[PDB]
Amino acid sequence: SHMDKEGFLNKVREAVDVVKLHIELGHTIRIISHRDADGITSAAILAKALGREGASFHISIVKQVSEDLLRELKDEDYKIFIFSALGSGSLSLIKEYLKEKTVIILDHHPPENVKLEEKHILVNPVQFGANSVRDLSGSGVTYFFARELNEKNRDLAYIAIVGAVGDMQENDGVFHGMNLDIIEDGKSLGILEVKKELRLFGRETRPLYQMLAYATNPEIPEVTGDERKAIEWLKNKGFNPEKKYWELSEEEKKKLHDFLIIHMIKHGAGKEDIDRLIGDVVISPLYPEGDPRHEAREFATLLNATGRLNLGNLGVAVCLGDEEAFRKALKMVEDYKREQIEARKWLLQNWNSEVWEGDHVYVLYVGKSIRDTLVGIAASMAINAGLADPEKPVIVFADTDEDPNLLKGSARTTERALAKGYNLGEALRKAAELVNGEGGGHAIAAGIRIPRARLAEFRKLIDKILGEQVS
Ligand SMILES: Nc1ccn([C@@H]2O[C@H](COP(=O)(O)O)[C@@H](O)[C@H]2O)c(=O)n1
Ligand SMILES: Nc1ccn([C@@H]2O[C@H](COP(=O)(O)O)[C@@H](O)[C@H]2O)c(=O)n1
Ligand SMILES: Nc1ccn([C@@H]2O[C@H](COP(=O)(O)O)[C@@H](O)[C@H]2O)c(=O)n1
Numbered sequence: 001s002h003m004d005k006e007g008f009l010n011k012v013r014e015a016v017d018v019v020k021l022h023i024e025l026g027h028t029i030r031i032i033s034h035r036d037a038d039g040i041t042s043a044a045i046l047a048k049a050l051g052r053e054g055a056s057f058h059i060s061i062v063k064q065v066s067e068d069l070l071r072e073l074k075d076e077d078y079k080i081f082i083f084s085a086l087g088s089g090s091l092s093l094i095k096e097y098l099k100e101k102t103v104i105i106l107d108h109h110p111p112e113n114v115k116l117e118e119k120h121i122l123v124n125p126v127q128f129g130a131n132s133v134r135d136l137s138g139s140g141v142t143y144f145f146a147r148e149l150n151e152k153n154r155d156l157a158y159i160a161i162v163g164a165v166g167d168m169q170e171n172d173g174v175f176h177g178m179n180l181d182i183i184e185d186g187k188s189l190g191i192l193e194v195k196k197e198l199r200l201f202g203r204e205t206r207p208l209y210q211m212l213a214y215a216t217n218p219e220i221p222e223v224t225g226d227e228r229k230a231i232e233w234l235k236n237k238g239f240n241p242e243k244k245y246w247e248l249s250e251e252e253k254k255k256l257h258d259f260l261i262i263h264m265i266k267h268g269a270g271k272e273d274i275d276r277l278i279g280d281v282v283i284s285p286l287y288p289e290g291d292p293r294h295e296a297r298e299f300a301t302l303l304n305a306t307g308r309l310n311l312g313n314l315g316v317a318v319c320l321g322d323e324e325a326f327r328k329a330l331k332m333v334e335d336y337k338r339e340q341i342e343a344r345k346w347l348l349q350n351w352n353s354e355v356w357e358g359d360h361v362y363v364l365y366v367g368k369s370i371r372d373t374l375v376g377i378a379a380s381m382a383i384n385a386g387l388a389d390p391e392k393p394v395i396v397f398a399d400t401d402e403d404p405n406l407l408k409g410s411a412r413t414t415e416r417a418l419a420k421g422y423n424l425g426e427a428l429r430k431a432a433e434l435v436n437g438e439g440g441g442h443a444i445a446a447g448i449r450i451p452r453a454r455l456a457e458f459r460k461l462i463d464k465i466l467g468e469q470v471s
């Protein structure tokens, strides 16, 4: 990939001009944002930026831009809608249901290849050469929107990076694309620092043995999922296992890094996993050490915890400095992490007996054993736990809140699988059109909803469609 950065920024400036037309008239800005760290930070960036202009706004945090959602937004009397961190795969639907409204899409998903009307403006870095999961996230698009609207919005650079980390834009251990420009803005203001550190959840709030035991991206062999063994390993290497990572000296951190790298090599971990163990970690002196907001991944996890309970609006308030919202959000992270480890335990126990393996895909139907909103994490964990061939994409389906006749599915894969030609977003979109469902997303990570009774048909279909992508 390679971004035309100034061309993208000129498109951003075009959207800023449109939103200013509505601010002048006192129009309330309707905001629809994705239910994850990327979308929650996106909405907070818009809330702070519009607040600086004295404009009013109304935020909803949602899972997807569905035809049903757009039917609802069609009847709302707002004059302008901003979709942030989602929507680029729903341009035809937005064109239909919001035809007589002004729409701004601040997003980084692979855009639907259709023509938009004059009052609908897509602001998407992928259209200017970006890799959708690496060069900029939804919070990043929203950040540059806010920055062009008012230069004072550069103080949102850390919140923007929180969304990027939540979206795993530094999944290979380093930041890329225009995320590096946001980082430079934040450094100039002194509100963020980039450290070369252990890229695991728990730098601020977890004891070291839980930082190691929670590691699923990448896993630490023999230690992941076993706090007792994590304690034994840490003590044997000379570390107080109850200490938090932020309490280690820089000398002690580097010693831990060496021990972990040697451990992964001795247990045969792959080069890709070793390379993303140590890398860019973003902290912020705006918050105290030991506070999850002090580090981007802990902050993103805190926001994801509010989204999981359908309290994304509380996550927005956390980003905006509401300390009472922060105290509530702290109480949601423990159940969030515990359920992920339980999902991994179920996968290890049931993968061999339940998974359907085609020529180009694994399809796992977990029934009700894993929450519908966790099937994506589960698919990724099947790869990281070594259950799945890294070159074969994994799709996990579960029963879902949304509909008793529906299955919610998530697809995940690796960069080496993408090198073979697979594109999960495109494959799921095309398969959904044939089994009376709905799907799409990134090449490396995508979602789909299908009727439960069409699962067997879907498995054969998606295997064939993925195979046709193999060049
Ligand atoms: N392999 C993986 C994949 C996801 N996760 C968790 O899932 C969260 C969000 O995952 P998605 O980006 O797939 O929605 C991450 O921030 C992390 O807490 C994990 O712990 N291990
Ligand atoms: N119909 C769909 C379903 C999911 N997606 C995208 O696919 C990605 C992964 O989906 P899940 O998080 O639902 O597994 C998300 O970025 C989501 O916005 C999409 O663009 N169109
Ligand atoms: N290298 C990467 C980068 C992102 N991802 C996934 O891509 C998705 C991006 O989230 P959105 O669809 O919400 O933008 C997340 O599920 C994230 O875990 C990945 O699976 N591998």
Ligand SMILES: [Zn+2]
Residues within 6 Å of the ligand: 002, 003
């Ligand atoms: Zn260039």
Ligand SMILES: [Zn+2]
Residues within 6 Å of the ligand: 034, 035, 036, 038, 039, 085
């Ligand atoms: Zn998102």
Ligand SMILES: [Zn+2]
Residues within 6 Å of the ligand: 038, 039, 085, 108, 137, 138, 167
């Ligand atoms: Zn995103």
